[PDB]
Structure formats: structure tokens, C-alpha cells
Amino acid sequence: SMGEIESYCNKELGPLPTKAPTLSKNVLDLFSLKGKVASVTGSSGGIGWAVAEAYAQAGADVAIWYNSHPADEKAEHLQKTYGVHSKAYKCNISDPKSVEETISQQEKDFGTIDVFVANAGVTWTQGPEIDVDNYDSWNKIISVDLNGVYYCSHNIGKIFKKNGKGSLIITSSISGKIVNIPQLQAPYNTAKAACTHLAKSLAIEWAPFARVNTISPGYIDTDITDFASKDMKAKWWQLTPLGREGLTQELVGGYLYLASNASTFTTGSDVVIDGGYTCP
Amino acid sequence: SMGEIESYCNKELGPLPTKAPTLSKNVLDLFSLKGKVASVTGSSGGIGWAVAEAYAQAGADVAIWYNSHPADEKAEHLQKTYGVHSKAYKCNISDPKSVEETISQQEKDFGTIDVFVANAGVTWTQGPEIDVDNYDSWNKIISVDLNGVYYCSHNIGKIFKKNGKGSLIITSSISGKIVNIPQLQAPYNTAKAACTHLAKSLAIEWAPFARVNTISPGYIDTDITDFASKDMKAKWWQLTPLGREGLTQELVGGYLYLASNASTFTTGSDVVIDGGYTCP
Amino acid sequence: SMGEIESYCNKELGPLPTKAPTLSKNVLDLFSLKGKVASVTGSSGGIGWAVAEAYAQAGADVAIWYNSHPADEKAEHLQKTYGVHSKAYKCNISDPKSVEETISQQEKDFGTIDVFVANAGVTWTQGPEIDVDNYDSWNKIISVDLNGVYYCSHNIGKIFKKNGKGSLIITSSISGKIVNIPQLQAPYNTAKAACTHLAKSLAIEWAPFARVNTISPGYIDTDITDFASKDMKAKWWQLTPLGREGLTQELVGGYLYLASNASTFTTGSDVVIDGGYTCP
Amino acid sequence: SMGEIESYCNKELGPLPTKAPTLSKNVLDLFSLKGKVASVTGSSGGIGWAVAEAYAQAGADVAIWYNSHPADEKAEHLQKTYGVHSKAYKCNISDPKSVEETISQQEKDFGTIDVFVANAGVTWTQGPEIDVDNYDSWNKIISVDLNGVYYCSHNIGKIFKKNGKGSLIITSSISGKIVNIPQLQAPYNTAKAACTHLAKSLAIEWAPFARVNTISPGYIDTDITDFASKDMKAKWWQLTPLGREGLTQELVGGYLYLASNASTFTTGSDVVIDGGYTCP
Ligand SMILES: NC(=O)c1ccc[n+]([C@@H]2O[C@H](COP(=O)([O-])OP(=O)(O)OC[C@H]3O[C@@H](n4cnc5c(N)ncnc54)[C@H](OP(=O)(O)O)[C@@H]3O)[C@@H](O)[C@H]2O)c1
Ligand SMILES: NC(=O)c1ccc[n+]([C@@H]2O[C@H](COP(=O)([O-])OP(=O)(O)OC[C@H]3O[C@@H](n4cnc5c(N)ncnc54)[C@H](OP(=O)(O)O)[C@@H]3O)[C@@H](O)[C@H]2O)c1
Ligand SMILES: NC(=O)c1ccc[n+]([C@@H]2O[C@H](COP(=O)([O-])OP(=O)(O)OC[C@H]3O[C@@H](n4cnc5c(N)ncnc54)[C@H](OP(=O)(O)O)[C@@H]3O)[C@@H](O)[C@H]2O)c1
Ligand SMILES: NC(=O)c1ccc[n+]([C@@H]2O[C@H](COP(=O)([O-])OP(=O)(O)OC[C@H]3O[C@@H](n4cnc5c(N)ncnc54)[C@H](OP(=O)(O)O)[C@@H]3O)[C@@H](O)[C@H]2O)c1
Ligand SMILES: CCOC(=O)CC(=O)CCl
Ligand SMILES: CCOC(=O)CC(=O)CCl
Ligand SMILES: CCOC(=O)CC(=O)CCl
Ligand SMILES: CCOC(=O)CC(=O)CCl
């Protein structure tokens, strides 16, 4: 009207400046997720399972996801070792309607969702793209890595808007900032940069209620990278300052930092747990 | 075998170092495109038409592209004002098979293609993405902006490999590096950031024969941006160091520099003709 | 010799792959700094004091630094509220010899240093640089913001190498990635980008023993930004997705995450706690 | 007053939008530098001499610079092979007063300066920085590479402001975006990132009259890189997608593009002629 300031990025923020949130006084009590539901996508893999366990260790009602590797002993293992409500859902991230059904079924069994981690995807292991004459492997990467992240984010955002709070954590890769040297995977790099910039784009629109960030890792030692020839894996160590492959336990710290109240001002950022690979 | 060096990025480069190309002595003679065919995608718009004319002015057999705005007087205008062979093709960039037909029909009427400019796309003008409940506008952006660029690049590369020379120029946007402040277009930013990294990824694989670059512009004064409300267009000038909107004649210099022999060492780069918008 | 791999970045890493560190199983126990000394530079200001308190809250022997605002009641307040050994040192960060004396006097009163935070600097508040005709304000910024960070890093590194472990945290600013729009501070932006890239450069060299990272913040509400006119401060909110100014308690989470064992794989990264300012 | 728009970046732009410049119709006539003076710093080396010759070939009154390698046959060679007024000046770029004397002596013998290229610097060839115990090699790099660029760009700006037109081209390196893998040069990388971000920072302040850009090259084949051991030079080819070292004739195209009217909208950008080194 008159005398108030209106934002240039998102006009729905209201009369600026927006009131700052109330934060604890002890630093260690900021990272606690007590009384929060954390739906982690692809929580039946290498990085997803570690993040789900780390969120459960912080007292969170984690929701497990799987597609073809049934994970119901994983959900039960978190409901008896830490006493946090958990469940396992079978969803095809590439199916627009299945994602909606699987997320509306999580806001009902848990009451609400306060933390989301879009951490599902597949890798391109077909060599240079100029050798494949069928647009079926490219279409698959863009369907699970990029389109799936949008399907998950478009539905979870609706839950955050009504609640007015939330935190989305897209799991891109260093392929969204560099090009993998030994292997030639252009479709994979293209999809991960798309997710990395989509996380930033949603931050401006979700600023009023939620937050969006990225946890782009490096060459973590999961079931994804444990197929490459030792000759290929030898060129990864030679180009990593730390000179090794990160473990799944070296990522939980970054994932729990962007989901808790500790990162109450980090919006649309990119935490690069790469071991220094993107620096050279 | 022994004594020779093999590249870490692309093993097909051969025994390193690769021999440097032969370049003219006069700088002004490096920018000439005499005896070269330059197929410019979407050459019936604002930026495509200017680039096609600029390539024709440099003595190049430019090929015009259009989808729904017939451009045959444009192709004829370039065949009588500069004396360079030209033609117009109707292709749906979002159709995987139509692109193949339209590119194989250009390698036959011109003999070869030496310069390609994937410069076709559509903008997202639906406001914040959390308000559209149908994945039909998102699917369209990812089909014309991202998938179209891959269809154009996957076919043109097959022509460069046989010839051993070429230059691809993907026309991404500053949306691949920033988020447009006043308007909220997440699907558009995601698609352009995808192309900006696909160009880099293809540079590693096309290193042996061709080169790939990006001409990410700012807020150029074309038919794309001549619909936004003056209130929206007023926030673009306020956040641009140069404090105005660039013209289509201020982009041809960057397009002719990455297509000619002047940029014989610029591979996988990103020339940002934005007026300084990404700096603030 | 033969059969072992030697790194391309730093040849002192040894025969790759380097053995991964031993990490706790509970995520919340990774962030604990028990039995660690954390020397925080400029710990008598706005961000330095908060980081020192947060490190003390995590059970660390924090060392306070000051130049002209005596901080000895701050050091005592941390030695009686948390029971962690602490002390205050008066050092001129711009004096090469004083830094050496003040760091050597900290490795003696504490036994060792396990965490360092180069978080001292001054701001450029003289308007556009083309109006000052004396190279005395530019020389001051490059002496405290950039040269001081090198003096601190060149001496602290000599302690990490002997111990074989450590973590350096340079506090750059978003000015190392963008240009502050309303105010015109070129010397300040130049110095902060220098620190931001120096942190990355030292990561490759300190890879064998220590780690180096950056905590580039946004427009935090400290004594540095509480002088700008409300007209200037009104343009900061309008260009921040979160639409406000961050608090000093919203930065401790990032500082404690890059100093503890949680970030045991984050080397040469850049955690941007800006509220989304660098996104648009 | 009322109805006009005032910029957020630089309030001296005037009532927005700023009128666009008048540009030729033929693309090849945009790159011509006829009737322009182009003072190229460090024009007695590898890249400086090539840029000076390329500017002279485009019809420009180039001014040669040297410190310890007298270059007066180079200036005379450009005044008899192309018929363009030229002269040679001996200046110590690290001396604040000498730069002022050498630039005021160039605005007098040529009438004005329309193009400046701050392209003087030295490289760090002392190995890892943790082995040198004297802050004299670090102080030299920050004096010639960073401070020298500010001295050159602080006096030239005063000439552009009175004329209202100009173009500054700082010659940073890929070291301002990456860390050189085989060699360990932290002081050099720190100084080049400083120059790269200073070019962007000056773009916002010089928007009203002049333009500032960067020509960050890769591993060009000049006298600077023709000392490294073939073992070191072998790791440069292996990590360069193009798999070779660029020549000084592959940079002139980029330097003439950012100095002429072709890049009349490229302000505060960064043209990376690296051969694809920064992509991996
Ligand atoms: N080093 C690395 O592996 C690395 C690098 C950086 C980033 N990332 C990214 O991190 C994510 C996690 O990788 P990871 O280590 O967990 O690999 P992983 O062991 O292969 O697990 C991938 C996860 O994604 C799920 N998933 C795959 N395709 C799916 C589909 N079509 N529909 C639904 N769920 C699907 C898998 O479920 P099921 O197994 O149950 O089918 C599993 O939970 C991936 O997006 C990967 O790109 C990892
Ligand atoms: N300021 C800006 O506009 C701006 C900013 C940065 C980047 N860009 C990018 O520059 C490119 C060109 O935009 P412009 O300025 O030329 O806008 P334009 O005047 O709307 O022209 C767009 C061009 O793309 C073609 N095209 C659109 N959809 C197509 C489809 N489905 N199949 C085939 N061709 C299709 C159009 O052909 P028809 O008209 O014949 O259908 C036309 O040639 C776009 O990719 C845009 O993203 C421009
Ligand atoms: N919003 C922000 O303020 C912001 C933005 C991003 C980054 N930063 C950076 O964060 C750092 C901390 O700033 P701040 O928030 O703590 O404000 P501040 O209180 O002004 O910080 C300056 C701190 O450094 C010390 N210091 C200053 N000049 C010194 C010198 N010449 N020698 C030794 N110590 C010196 C001061 O100690 P004394 O007061 O005791 O002299 C004080 O502890 C600065 O480097 C700033 O550039 C802050
Ligand atoms: N591959 C590369 O070499 C490479 C990589 C990227 C960027 N660069 C940068 O490009 C610039 C040019 O290097 P170059 O290829 O021309 O090699 P160079 O011949 O060694 O370049 C140095 C140039 O600057 C002058 N110069 C050096 N120190 C000076 C000082 N203290 N005062 C005044 N003038 C001084 C030299 O003049 P005198 O010889 O007459 O003293 C010479 O013209 C450097 O800044 C370099 O960092 C080059
Ligand atoms: C061997 C193929 O493995 C990969 O795709 C590696 C990554 O995901 C790195 Cl982001
Ligand atoms: C008003 C919508 O117009 C746009 O989308 C503008 C651009 O393309 C900038 Cl890249
Ligand atoms: C008003 C001057 O205040 C500043 O310098 C602000 C910052 O440090 C932002 Cl990094
Ligand atoms: C062997 C030392 O040579 C260098 O410093 C190389 C460069 O300047 C690359 Cl930017």
C-alpha cells in the first residue's frame, strides 16, 4: 500500500522484512529433528538408506521408498532400534500419478511431512552418446533423474505451502558442475545440472514457506560406482585431492545439516561433498 | 604402446598432443566463413534470423528453419542480397524423426554442414509452477528446449565425425546460471541449465572432431520478451548494469566468433552476452 | 615404483587410495568437538563470537582473538559456562610477524590446534572506487581481508602438517561470487574472491593432512551491516528470496559442520549461507 | 522525480532505460577498430604482442608496454607494416606512480584511449606455498598480478569517464576458476581470481561509460609455460579435452571481439579460451 517494501523475487513474501524464525540457543540442539517427519526418496539404496538412518538417529519419523528392491526390513529396523515411526512405500518415481498417490499416503500415515529428500536416480553406463542410435536410454535418464525430481517436488511443495514450513533436499551430483573425465555420460550430466538448477529455481518460489537445497556428492562408495573397472576407478583417485572415494557415512552430516534448523538461512544453496574433485 | 600419451578425457584423441590447426595470419580473415555451410535452427525468429543474416554476410550457405511461421522470403532474401546458397526447412524440433529427416536433407542440398546453432525453444509464461496441476506445460518445455537440443546435437554430431570438423552453438539463456527475479519460471530455467551443461558434456566427447559452445544471452529485445508488462520489464532494467535490453545485433558478434576459425581453441565455453545481469 | 597409483593433484598423498578415516556410527556424535582446540580469528565481533560460543558449546577449547575491542570477559565467560579452556589474544592480522607469535603462543597454551577459522576483515565503505585518489583504502582491504588470511593460513598449516589432521575455515562473503548491487565496493569484492579461491587452492596442497573450506555468508545482521541507510538496507531485503537479514545464530550450524567430523569428505567446498541471494 | 526508473546497481546510469548504441549493419564491419587507440599492457611478451598485432591489423593505434625486455622494434614494426601510429613505454606495473605517468603520457601522444588490456603478470614457480618461509614471493605476485591490474584500471577509468566510452579487458587465467593440478601455485590462483572478480565489480561501476571483461585463457604456448618439465606438460595435455596447448593466435579472436563494437552488450563477462580444461 504505502510505506511497506515488496520483494522483487517473490511478491508473496509479504511486507518485508520477513520475521526471522525462533532458534534454540545451544548449537547441538539445532540439528535435532525431534517431532519431524522426513520422507526420503530412494531410501533402499546406498545414500538413501544412510540418510534415512541418520534422520532416524536424530529422532525423525522417516518414510522409506523403494521400486524393485523391497525394503520392509529396513523400515522395521528403524522402528525398533530408535523408536521412530517408519514405513516403506513402493513407488515408480517416473510415474506422475504414482508419486502423487505415494505422497498423499504419507501425509496420512504420519500427519505431515517436514523434510523431503529427492534422492532417486539411475546412471548412464552406455559410453559416449554418439554411439546409441535409439532415444530410449536418454529418455529414461530424463524420466527418472529429472522428471521424477519435478514430480516429487511439485507434490511435496503443496504440503509445505499449507503447513508453511519444510525443507527439500535434491540429491544432484558433481556432474551438474563438471564432466566426468574417464567415463562419457552426457545424458547423466545434463539431467543432474537440470536438478541442481531446479533446486535453485524452486527456492525463489518456495521462499515464503519452504527451503530447497542440493547435496551434490562426489564419487561416493555405493552400489552405483561399484561396477566401474579398476582402471576407470584408478583415474577417479588420481583426480581427487583427498585421493579416495567417499563413504555413505560422510554424507549424512551434510544431509542432516540442511534438513534441521541449523540451516535456517541456507536457501537454494549447493553443499558439494566431493572430496575436492571440482576444485582441480 | 610405449612413449605416447593417452588422454584422460577422451581416449579417441589419439597420441597426444593433438596437432594444432592451421590459422590465417590476419585477425580479420579468421572471422570469415567463406566456403562453409551454417545450419541455424529456429532461423525464423528474433535471434535466429539475425544470426542467419550475420552468417550469410560472412559468406556462408545458411539453412533456414521454421515450424509455424513460414520463412521462405527470408531464405530468398539471403540468396539475392549476398549471393550465398540458402534454403528453408519446416521441422518440428520436438519430433525425434523429423529432425533426422530435416538434417539429412540439408547434408544433401549443401554437401556438408560446418556450423550448427541449436537456437529453438519456447518460454514458460504460466507463473509459479506450484499453481499448474497438469504436467503438460512442463513436459512441453522439456520437449522443445532440452530434448530438441539433444535431437539436433545427436544427429549433427554424426556429420561432424565423418568430416572431422565442425562447431556446435547451443543458445541457452542466463536462466542456466541465475533465476529470473520478477517472473517465476522454474521449468524454463531447468531446461536452459540442462542445455548449458549438455553443451559442455558434448565438448568432451566431440573434442576429437568438433567443438561445442554456448551463447547464453540476457534480456534481448526479441518477440519472446515483447509481451511482459512494463512493470515486469521495469525490474529488468533496474537489475542490469548496462540498464537496458540488448538488441539482436549485439548477439551476432558472439555467434560469428564461436562459429568461425577465430575461436579455434574455445571448446565447451559459455559466452554470456547479458549486459552484466549475472554479476549483481 | 610399480603397481601403485600416484595422485595427479598432490603427489604427497602416497600410494592411492588413501585410507578413509574412522567415523562414529551415530550422526549426532559426529558434530561433537570434544577434545579439540578451535582457534577462531576475530572472535570479538559479530560472527566470530557466535562461532566461538558454538564451538565451546560443542566442547572445544576455543581461543579468542581481538585487535582493538578487548575481549577478555568473553574468554572467561566461555571458561565458566561450559568448562572449556579458553584464552584471549591481541593480534594485528595485518602484521606478518604478530600472527606467527600469536599462533605459536596458542600451540603452547593448548598443546595443539585442531580447528581454525580465519574470520577477520574490514569492509569498504567509501563508495565507488573511481572517486578515491589515494591507494591507502585499497591497500588496507588487501592487507586485512586477503593478506591476513594468508598469514593465518601459512602459519596454521605448519601445525596441521606435523599433526596430520586439521580443518581450516575461511570466512569469505557472497561478494566472492556476486557484486553487491546498491553499494559499490570493488576492493572488498576483489579481496573476498581472492580468499574464496585461496581456500580452494590450499585444499589441494593441504589434502594430505588438513582440509580447507569456506563459509561465505550473505547479509548477516552483525555490527558490519548495521550502519547502512535503511534505503540501502531496503534493497537488500527486496533481492533476497527469504526476504530478510540472517542472524548470527543461523551461521553457527554451517561453521560447526565444517569443523567437526561430520564433514570428513568436504574439502575445498563453499557453503553459501546467503538466504538465496546468489540465486537470482 | 516521478515516472522515471532509477537503477539499483549504479544510480548514475540516469533515467532508465539507457539508449542503445548505434551499430553497423554488416557483421564484419563491427569488429573493425578503425580510428581507435588500444593501449595493451605487457605488449612485449607472448600474449600481449599477439593482441597488439591483432589490434593493429584491425586499424588501431596500439601502444606497446615493456618493463625489462625493450620493445621498440615491435612498435616500429607496427608503424610500417600496417600504417597505424604506435609507441613503446617502459613502466613498472607494480609502481603506483609509474602507471599514472605512463598512462597520462599515452592520452597525450594519441589524444585518447578507447581500448585497454591489462595483460601483465608473473607466475608462481616455487612449488607448494607451505615450503617458502618468506612473504616476499607471495607479496610479489599480489603486487604485479592483482595490485598492478588495479593501478592500470584505476587510471584508465578516469579517461573513459570523461570520454564516456571505452572497453577494459583484464587477462586473468583459468586459475581464477580452477586449481592447476600438477603444479601447486596457490598465490597465483588467488591473484587471478581477484582480477577476475575485480573485472566484474568494475563493470557495475563503469556501466555508465565503459565496459569491463575478462579473457581468461588456458595453457597457451607462450614463454611462461615453456619452462615446465615435459612430465608436467604431459599432464596438461591429458586433462585438456582438445588434447594440446593453445597458440597465441587462438586468443586474438577473443581479444578483438571484446574490444570492438561486436561485443557492445557483453559487460562483466568472462570469455574462457581454455580448450575445455575447466569442463572436466
Ligand atoms: N557415487 C554415487 O553413486 C553418486 C554420486 C553422486 C550422486 N549420486 C546420486 O545419488 C542418488 C542415490 O544413488 P545411490 O547411491 O542410492 O544408488 P543406488 O544404490 O543405485 O540406489 C538408487 C536408489 O534410487 C532408487 N531408484 C532407482 N531408479 C528408480 C526408479 N525408476 N523409480 C524409483 N526409485 C528408483 C533405488 O530404488 P531400488 O534399488 O529399490 O530400485 C534406490 O533407492 C542417485 O540419484 C545418484 O544419481 C550418487
Ligand atoms: N530475450 C530472449 O528472448 C532470450 C533470452 C535468452 C535466450 N533466448 C533463447 O533464444 C532462442 C530463440 O528465441 P527467439 O528470441 O528467437 O524467440 P522467437 O522470436 O519466439 O523465436 C523462437 C524460434 O524457435 C522456433 N521454435 C519455437 N518452438 C519450436 C518448435 N516446437 N519446433 C521448432 N521450432 C520452434 C520458432 O520457429 P517459429 O516461430 O517459426 O515457430 C523461432 O524460429 C530460444 O531458445 C530462447 O530460449 C532468448
Ligand atoms: N554481514 C556481514 O557482516 C558479513 C558478510 C559476509 C561476510 N562477513 C565477513 O565476516 C567477517 C566477520 O565480520 P563480523 O560480522 O564479525 O563484523 P565485525 O565485528 O566488524 O568483524 C571484524 C572482526 O575482525 C576483527 N578485526 C577487524 N579488523 C582487524 C584487524 N585489522 N586486525 C585484527 N582483527 C581485526 C575484529 O576485532 P575487533 O573488533 O576487536 O577489532 C572483529 O572480531 C569479516 O571478515 C566480514 O568481511 C560478514
Ligand atoms: N599460458 C600462459 O602463459 C597464460 C595463461 C593464462 C593467463 N596468462 C596471463 O597472461 C599474461 C601474459 O603472459 P604472457 O603469455 O605474455 O607471458 P610473459 O611474456 O611472461 O608475460 C609477461 C608480460 O608482462 C610484462 N611484465 C611482467 N612482469 C612485469 C612487471 N613487474 N612490470 C611490468 N610489466 C611486467 C612482461 O614484459 P617484460 O617481459 O618486458 O618484462 C611481458 O610483456 C600474464 O599475466 C599471465 O599470467 C597467460
Ligand atoms: C561408472 C559410472 O558411475 C557413475 O555414474 C559415477 C557417478 O554417478 C558420479 Cl556423479
Ligand atoms: C517474460 C518471459 O520472458 C522470458 O522468458 C525472458 C527470457 O526468456 C529471459 Cl532468458
Ligand atoms: C554496507 C556495507 O556492508 C557490507 O559490506 C555488506 C557486506 O559485507 C556483505 Cl558481504
Ligand atoms: C608451469 C607454470 O606455468 C603456469 O603458471 C601455467 C599458467 O600460468 C596457467 Cl594459467
Place of cell 539453412: B63
C-alpha cell at C245: 537479514
Please state, in angstroms and rounded to a whole number, the distance separating the CA atoms of residues C261 and C36: 11
* Three-state DSSP class for residue B209: coil
Q: Tell me, what DSSP letter sits at residue D222?
A: S
Contact C252 A262 (CB under 8 A): yes
**CB neighbour list of residue B161: distance below 8 Å, 6 or more residues apart:** A130, B208, B209, B210
How does strand B60-66 pair with strand B36-40? parallel
Instruction: Tell how far the Cα of A45 is from the centroid of ligand 5, in angstroms.
Output: 15
- Residues of chain B with C-beta less than 8 angstroms from the C-beta of A277: none
In this complex, the residue of B218, B266, B275 whose CB is nearest that of residue D273 is B266
C-alpha cell at A135: 532415444
- Residues of chain D with C-beta less than 8 angstroms from the C-beta of A178: 279-280
Strand order in the sheet with A115-117: A87-90, A60-66, A36-40, A115-117, A168-170, A212-214
- Residues of chain A with C-beta less than 8 angstroms from the C-beta of B195: 190
Please state, in angstroms and rounded to a whole number, the distance separating the CA atoms of residues A112 and A107: 5
Residue C3, Ramachandran bin (φ over 0: left; ψ between -120 and 50: alpha; else beta): left
The set of protein residues with a Cβ atom below 6 angstroms from ligand 7 is: C 123, 125, 173-175, 180, 183, 185, 188, 219, 224-225, 228
Method used to determine the 3D structure: cryo-EM
* B174 Cβ below 6 A of ligand 6: yes
C-alpha cell at C198: 585461496
Our answer to whether residue C269 is catalytic in this structure is: no
Burial, D238: exposed, middle or buried (Cβ in 10 Å; 0-12, 13-18, 19+)? Answer: buried
Please state, in angstroms and rounded to a whole number, the distance separating the CA atoms of residues B47 and B247: 9
Residue type, A18: T
**B217: which strand partners?**
B273
Q: Are C253 and A257 in contact (CB under 8 A)?
A: yes
Strand order in the sheet with D212-214: D87-90, D60-66, D36-40, D115-117, D168-170, D212-214
Q: How many helices and strands in chain D, by DSSP H and E? A: 9, 6
Alpha-carbon distances of B273 from B238, B278, D40, rounded to whole Å = 17, 10, 23
Name the nearest CA neighbour of D239 among D194, D213, D276, D197.
D276
Please state, in angstroms and rounded to a whole number, the distance separating the CA atoms of residues A134 and B184: 35
Please state, in angstroms and rounded to a whole number, the distance separating the CA atoms of residues D162 and D154: 14
C-alpha cell at A190: 545434463
Name the nearest CA neighbour of A31 among C26, D115, B137, D18.
C26
Handedness of CA C129, C134, C135, C140 (dihedral sign): negative
**3-state per-residue secondary structure call for chain A:** CCCCECCCCCHHHCCECCCCCCCCCCHHHCCCCCCEEEEECCCCCCHHHHHHHHHHHCCEEEEEEECCCCCCHHHHHHHHHCCCCCEEEECCCCCHHHHHHHHHCHHHHCCCCCEEECCCCCCCCCCCHHHCCCCCHHHHHHHHHHHHHHHHHHHHHHHHHHHCCCCEEECCCHHHCCCCCCCCCHHHHHHHHHHHHHHHHHHHHHCCCCCEEECCECCCCCCCCCCCCHHHHHHHHHCCCCCCCCCHHHCHHHHHHCCCHHHCCCCCCECCECCCCCCC
Nearest atom of ligand 6 to the alpha carbon of B173:
10
Place of cell 566401474: A228
Strand order in the sheet with C60-66: C87-90, C60-66, C36-40, C115-117, C168-170, C212-214
Please state, in angstroms and rounded to a whole number, the distance separating the CA atoms of residues A169 and A273: 14
Q: A166 φ, ψ to 5°?
A: 165, 180
How does strand B36-40 pair with strand B115-117? parallel
C-alpha cell at C149: 588470511
Our answer to whether residue B173 is catalytic in this structure is: yes
Q: C15 φ, ψ to 5°?
A: -70, 110
Nearest atom of ligand 3 to the alpha carbon of C46:
16
Q: Are A268 and A212 in contact (CB under 8 A)?
A: yes
Q: Are D33 and D256 in contact (CB under 8 A)?
A: yes
Angle, to 10 degrees, between the axis of helix B186-205 and the axis of helix B147-163? 20
C-alpha cell at D199: 573485472
C-alpha cell at A279: 576444485
Mutate to test the pocket of ligand 4, among D140, D224, D236, D271 (most ligand atoms within 8 A of CB): D224
* A220 Cβ below 6 A of ligand 1: yes
